[PDB]
Write a protein that binds this ligand. Structure first.
Ligand SMILES: [Zn+2]
Length: 393
């Protein structure tokens, strides 16, 4: 049986109000599946996180629009089993296990109250969960995997903002929503080693596509995201960090080090908010004080802990910013991947990673004991054409 995903959810499965539920994104309800503590999956196209982006009608170099995708319960059960299977694959790694744990730990901070002495949740770091008796109760979560909006292949990580606070960047953190599909993959290129096998089309293992957005999710959960302002003469610092590898030192070790001490200080600001705290709204004040100490790897002192172990911050901060990277995950999955984010994808492939004969948790497309095992022939869209239907812009 499983390990990350508690049970095997079918979309047919009956609402129970706890892990199978109709919810409201903080509008009409959607069935949602709590695959793991703090992590839900919504197998719908995302019409909800954007008040403007409330449609799927076509209006970016590579794009793909189909208003009907993720419409049938047959699609939604598959979408769910895909994300599930992709969750298991990423968790099957020492890297993916550690990052999912940082993500489950990374509970968004209680910086909600105008009141300086008071801890309160921020409304947006919740969903409203309709309990079978036909009533709604707010539940905190860290992560939502949701299906895409109009552009099917527009994968991202977003979060409800604060009227004053930069939640993903002040250390607080915020509930994270990933528009993601295990139902599509993009083509990239590399001509192997056999010096040159011309211009072939390999497919991205969508476990990498998912890993990418989780690393963003982890960044934004620990409120250590880099301002999307910060770019390369034009590519996001946050993306270059997230991709990692040869790209990673395009970001100067100058801003690398100011970014680090800026977050150290926003951690200390957070450790003072707790100590100064004398009240709580809605769990125990101390229980909730100890979840954030667990989160920010806080210390011990009988007067009232307070201290940030600058040595322990360093190990968390780097784990999140410099080890949790797309490149490192590529070495673990042992797949053919982009050698840079500065790439672009060329083609869009319809895939089905659900049937174990198509894709596994341990090898993805590149199945053991087959031709797909050699030379990443699993990911090669010319050889494994039976697992990739090319589509256009
Ligand atoms: Zn990204």
């Amino acid at each position: 049986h499983m390990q990350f995903v508690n049970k095997q959810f079918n979309y047919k499965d009956p609402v129970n109000g706890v892990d199978i539920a109709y919810i409201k994104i903080p509008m009409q309800p959607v069935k949602a599946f709590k695959i793991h503590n703090k992590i839900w999956v919504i197998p719908e196209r995302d019409t909800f996180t954007n008040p403007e982006e409330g449609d799927l009608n076509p209006p970016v170099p590579v794009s793909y629009y189909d208003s009907t995708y993720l419409s049938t319960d047959n699609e939604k059960d598959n979408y769910l089993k895909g994300v599930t299977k992709l969750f298991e694959r990423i968790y099957s790694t020492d890297l993916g296990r550690m990052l999912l744990t940082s993500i489950v730990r990374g509970i968004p901070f209680w910086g909600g109250s105008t009141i300086d002495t008071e801890l309160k949740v921020i409304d947006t770091n919740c969903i409203n969960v309709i309990q079978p008796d036909g009533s709604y109760r707010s539940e905190e979560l860290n992560l939502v995997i949701i299906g895409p909006s109009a552009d099917i292949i527009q994968f991202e990580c977003k979060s409800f903002g604060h009227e004053v606070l930069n939640l993903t960047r002040n250390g607080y953190g915020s509930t994270q929503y990933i528009r993601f599909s295990p139902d599509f993959t993009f083509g990239f290129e590399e001509s192997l080693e056999n010096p040159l096998l011309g211009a072939g089309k390999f497919a991205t293992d969508p476990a990498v596509t998912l890993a990418h957005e989780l690393i963003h999710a982890g960044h934004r959960l620990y409120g250590i995201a880099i301002n999307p302002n910060r770019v390369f003469k034009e590519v996001s610092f946050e993306e270059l960090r997230t991709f990692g590898g040869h790209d990673a030192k395009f970001i100067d070790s100058l801003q690398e080090n100011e970014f680090r001490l800026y977050y150290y200080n926003k951690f200390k600001d957070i450790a003072s908010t707790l100590n100064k705290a004398k009240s709580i709204v809605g769990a125990s004040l101390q229980y909730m004080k100890n979840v954030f100490k667990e989160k920010y790897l806080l210390s011990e002192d009988t007067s009232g802990k307070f201290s940030v172990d600058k040595l322990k911050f360093d190990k968390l901060y780097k784990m999140l910013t410099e080890i949790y990277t797309e490149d490192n995950f590529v070495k673990f999955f042992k797949v053919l991947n982009r050698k840079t984010y500065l790439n672009f994808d060329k083609a869009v492939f319809k895939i089905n990673i659900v049937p174990k004969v198509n894709y596994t948790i341990y090898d993805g497309f590149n199945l053991r004991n087959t031709n797909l095992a050699a030379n990443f022939n699993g990911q090669n869209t010319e050889i494994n054409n039976m697992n990739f239907t090319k589509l256009k812009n």
